[PDB]
């Protein structure tokens, strides 16, 4: 099952403990490997006590569709993961925000959905869990510990999020058009008017490919072409001490600027390793993250490095004839 990027599943001891603001791309990735980001969201927004992801971690998060390709690539980043990394926001749900059918919302404490305009989450709180429909949170004694299993976390869609290569607006609009040209029956996706209809059907499931080019709405696609390029950036490397654990901002920056630090073959190839010194000791070792690389999509005639890309479910409204 997938695999801890840098930190094993968390074994928390008290529901009332702090969620620290670590400052290193590493320290953060540890907090993601251990479902701290979700725990925070639950607390912050949905007024929740404790941690979700006990003993399991991000590796055990429940997914829909359960056959999630990107789940195996630990480095591939969910929408929630990237919120902690500042790349986007997962928003507290509003009545408007539609909860999709299909997923096994039951006992779930958190579920996340990419929406046509953004990314949204629906959190329960203390001693409660979602009903069999996602629509309501209800008392669940098996959630009284506040140290909850990872399975109570549902991330929907086969989403991969990454650092965008910013595109102009002209391109976005060209892309907007092409999608409408490709999907000419849809009227509103998740509530955002996609094509002019006046004759809308009632909201209905819709499973589509999509990328976040970095503008108002996601662009949806039928015939896309994806190439996963490897780029060996510093963000493609994580620095750890075998023992202490994650390394701190300076230690990482140092490692990623010095060579000295122990590392795997590629890290040496890229930035430098150094050996013959370590007697007993221990120093930060850095390693490449496990992922196909950075994805580049091809659509409308145009090649885009999108922020996020994936195939997810988005309630939508088709024409009337």
């Amino acid at each position, epitope marked *: 099952d997938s695999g801890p990027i840098i930190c094993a599943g968390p*074994i928390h001891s008290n529901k009332s403990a702090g969620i620290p603001h670590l400052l290193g791309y590493s320290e953060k990735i540890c907090q993601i490997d251990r479902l701290i980001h979700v725990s925070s969201w639950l607390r912050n927004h949905s007024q929740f006590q404790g941690y979700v992801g*006990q*003993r399991g971690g991000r590796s055990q998060v429940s997914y829909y569709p359960a056959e999630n390709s990107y789940s195996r690539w630990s480095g591939l980043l969910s929408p929630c993961d990237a919120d902690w990394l500042g790349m986007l926001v997962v928003k507290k749900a509003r009545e408007s925000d539609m909860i999709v059918p299909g997923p096994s919302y039951k006992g779930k404490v958190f579920f996340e959905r990419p929406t046509f305009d953004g990314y949204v989450g629906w959190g329960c709180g203390s001693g409660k869990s979602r009903t069999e429909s996602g629509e309501l949170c209800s008392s669940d004694s*098996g*959630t009284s510990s506040g*140290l909850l*299993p990872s399975d109570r976390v549902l991330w929907i869609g086969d989403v991969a999020c990454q650092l965008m290569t910013p595109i102009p607006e002209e391109t976005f609009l060209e892309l907007k058009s092409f999608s409408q040209s490709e999907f000419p029956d849809i009227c509103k996706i998740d509530g955002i008017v996609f094509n002019q209809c006046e004759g809308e059907s009632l909201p209905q499931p819709f499973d589509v490919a999509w990328m976040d080019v970095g503008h108002s709405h996601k662009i949806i696609m039928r015939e896309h072409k994806t190439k996963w390029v490897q780029e060996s950036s510093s963000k493609d490397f994580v620095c750890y001490k075998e023992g202490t654990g994650p390394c701190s901002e300076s230690e990482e920056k140092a490692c990623k600027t010095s060579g000295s630090c122990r590392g795997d073959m590629q890290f040496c190839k890229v930035a430098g390793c150094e050996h013959g010194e370590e007697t007993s000791e221990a120093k930060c070792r850095c390693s490449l993250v496990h992922k196909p690389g950075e994805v580049v999509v091809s659509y409308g005639g145009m090649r885009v490095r999108p922020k996020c890309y994936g195939f997810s479910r988005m309630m939508a409204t088709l024409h009337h004839h």
Partner: antibody
Amino acid sequence: VQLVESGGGVVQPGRSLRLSCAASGFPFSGYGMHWVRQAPGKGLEWVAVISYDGSEKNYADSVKGRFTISRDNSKNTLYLQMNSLRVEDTAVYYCAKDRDYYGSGFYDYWGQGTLVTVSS
Amino acid sequence: DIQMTQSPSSLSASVGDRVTITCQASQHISNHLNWYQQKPGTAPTLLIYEASNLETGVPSRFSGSGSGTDFSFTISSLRPEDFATYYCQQYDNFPLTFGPGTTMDIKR
């Protein structure tokens, strides 16, 4: 909180026994449940664990194939079926609640113990 | 899997003096060692969890420290109640292993 054991007694090698850790005061269905035994004169040895809904079970060795742990969250009792009992298993048996959901290993509240002797 | 060895086997100190127990390990346990008190004839009681925290009701005389393999559990001012057997316990890897116990005894 109150865990209270019951079921212990004299038994001879080969026979089987059943224990029961009835609970009060606390949400029995939200916490994992343990079994810890103390041999007369010796120290502490954890026996078996069970999770919130009674699915994920992790026994120790020295009991695997001889011990089956179970629970009934409707009547708030913890069971432990001990078959193939041997002399090495003569000990005082405790049940313990766990702060977590699965039995991660925090024995916050202990029971008052019951005694099981195994000899012919 | 993980052998937890305590020391000393038995102390002999009188009321008011300061005690120190030591509990080692064969692997990195991180901050995942609990501590237990067991009075004779009673049931064990959790004193310190995660090697620093004091479970509700534990007085401030009892202290704990340690991270990795070597830990310690420090009583500063011994009182007649505090004379019992003390155990450490890891929870880094099931099966959950205990220590062999330290038997605090009084002195005259």
